Amino acid sequence: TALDPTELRSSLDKPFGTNRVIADDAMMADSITPAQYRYHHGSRVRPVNWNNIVDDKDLDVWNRLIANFWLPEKVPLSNDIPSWRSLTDLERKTTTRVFTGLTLLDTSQATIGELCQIEHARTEHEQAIYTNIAFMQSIHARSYSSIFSTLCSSEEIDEAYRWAVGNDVLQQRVTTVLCEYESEDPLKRKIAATMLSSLLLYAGFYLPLYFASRGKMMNTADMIRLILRDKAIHGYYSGYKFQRGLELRSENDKKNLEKFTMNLLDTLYDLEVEYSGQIYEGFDFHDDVFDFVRYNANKALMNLGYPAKYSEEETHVSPEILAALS
Amino acid sequence: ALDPTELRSSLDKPFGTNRVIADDAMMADSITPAQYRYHHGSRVRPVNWNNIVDDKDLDVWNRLIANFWLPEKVPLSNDIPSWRSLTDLERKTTTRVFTGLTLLDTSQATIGELCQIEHARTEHEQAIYTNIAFMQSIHARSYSSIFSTLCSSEEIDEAYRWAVGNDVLQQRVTTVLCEYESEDPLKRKIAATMLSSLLLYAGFYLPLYFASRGKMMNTADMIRLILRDKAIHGYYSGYKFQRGLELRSENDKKNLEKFTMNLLDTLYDLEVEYSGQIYEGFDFHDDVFDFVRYNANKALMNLGYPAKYSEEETHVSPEILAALS
């Protein structure tokens, strides 16, 4: 912009005075969170108050997510080295590639996807929760790299990252979600975040669950379950907050958002078939993977308050996989 | 133009269904997810912690993660007798000071640190800002943990109303918030370094003063956990500022230094107005601003600029310096 580069950007705004008052109820009601200031210059900004909880769910979720803090350095991943070497070359290659594509999704959520939920959050405590969630998504992304450092050669890691950048369908998947985070409708942002946490990684999580059901990669499975323990809350909470915003919307917007949700799901589902169907086509468990995808698609919808899309017939995950989930 | 039920990505050309092992040019043109909004159609790259670009990033990530803490592990309730031994003025001033600090850390956690991600120099630095913002939410939360342990509902209510109703506090926070909107990423970094290395220290003076007097000893421990974080936060902001600065033109370097001194001078005068009024009934008034100017020099040093204040102007009392450690 044309402001002299040595000037403060606040010089464009009328300064606050020199008064000091105990804000009355109207002044407090008009105050805003810091993240809302960008489009409300001149409004008064209010610090977070953890002794004034607006939605008790926020305090419960904060406390649960923080109690569940973990680091990949505490999982003995090197005890999986013999199991990893007992796999085939195709199994190893498929695992590093699948995990690199999961890294891409968690990298995106950590550095923009979850963070863009803050500005239009319903409560200030929810804003703080998103900072914890985004950090833990950086932990998730970092943790796949911890697996690679323990198990893979430099050449294997390098080729998997080149595979991910060069996979057109992977790129379509991630950028489909990234574009919705640019919407000015915060509920479109919430729907995408819910899809990311409750659906988009699960065709990938199927693979380490499969190995664990066959007695392989057991310590890696523990770490995957730590990731899953976070993401189940992340997707529940995103969908919960979507519904808190939805119930204040007009009937017009409610219909738009319902149709938008089904369009996004359909598109992301088709892309999963193309993406993971190609990755898994040389494996017996190919069809079970998409039972598992549709099963988690139903949870994503349920987290948003919408009815299930797929029938029991279409979501029958083998008992061995479900047992590996715990 | 898009119907509201349609996907925003439908406005862009789709990627195909090709799958290739990216060559060097394709990898070099790939970008981080936070840059995608400025480069639709570009390929997005997952973070690779086995391909560190700046070794300093890995050291800072590991140090900050190892320093994780929660206010619930500090026995703040052992300060209740000490708190009750204070005067009315001391208790009121503490809740107001800490509510003002809450406002700055709330701002950094929820926008201030996060707006550094999109123009970060490395993907690992982007991950670090997510840790730093979370810990800044911890800092802000911890002041409320103090209030929950020590204060009445009425005290808490009045302190938050005081903060919203304090014009000078509002000017201080909004001055910083406006720079986070700057189109120049290095201005965002200068502001972040000021916040972590300067803006809270007139406030941190008070618990350090109490500890130097033998009071509020467990609260002081928590404050030192906060300081242990902010020292790295401000060092890291300033380090990354300097890495970005060495790629800028000579005229931009000159303007950025002038802007820095303009920001600092504006924030200093506001501190005198804000904390001078808060500490008016206390005799340690002069020592507070020796401590402010002392930390201002560190903020400038973190940015790679010379000290502004003389040895005479930064002569912190040795009781306060001892309470830092």
Residue numbers in the entry:
A (entry chain A): 7 to 332
B (entry chain C): 8 to 332
Give verbatim excerpts from the published study on this entry.
Class I ribonucleotide reductases (RNRs) convert ribonucleotides into deoxyribonucleotides under oxic conditions. The R2 subunit provides a radical required for catalysis conducted by the R1 subunit. The discovery of a metal-free R2 defined the new RNR subclass Ie. In R2e, three of the otherwise strictly conserved metal-binding glutamates in the active site are substituted.
The second crystal structure we solved was from R2 protein coexpressed with R1, NrdI and NrdH, hereafter called BvR2eQSK-DOPA. Crystals belong to the same space group with similar unit cell dimensions and resolution. The two structures are similar overall with an Cα root-mean-square deviation (RMSD) value of 0.16 Å. The conserved tyrosine close to the active site shows an additional density, corresponding to a modification to a DOPA. Composite omit maps confirmed that the tyrosine is modified between structures. Overlaying both structures shows no further structural reorganization; all other active site residues are in the same position. The conformation of the active site residues DOPA150, D112 and K237 aligns best with the radical-lost ground state of MfR2e and differs from the radical state, suggesting that we observe an inactive state of the protein in our structures. However, the hydrogen bonding network and water structure in the active site between the VPK and QSK versions of R2 are clearly different due to the bulkier Q and S compared to V and P. This will likely contribute to the differences in activity between R2eVPK and R2eQSK. The in vitro activity of RNRQSK is therefore dependent on the presence of DOPA in R2 and reduced NrdI in an aerobic environment.
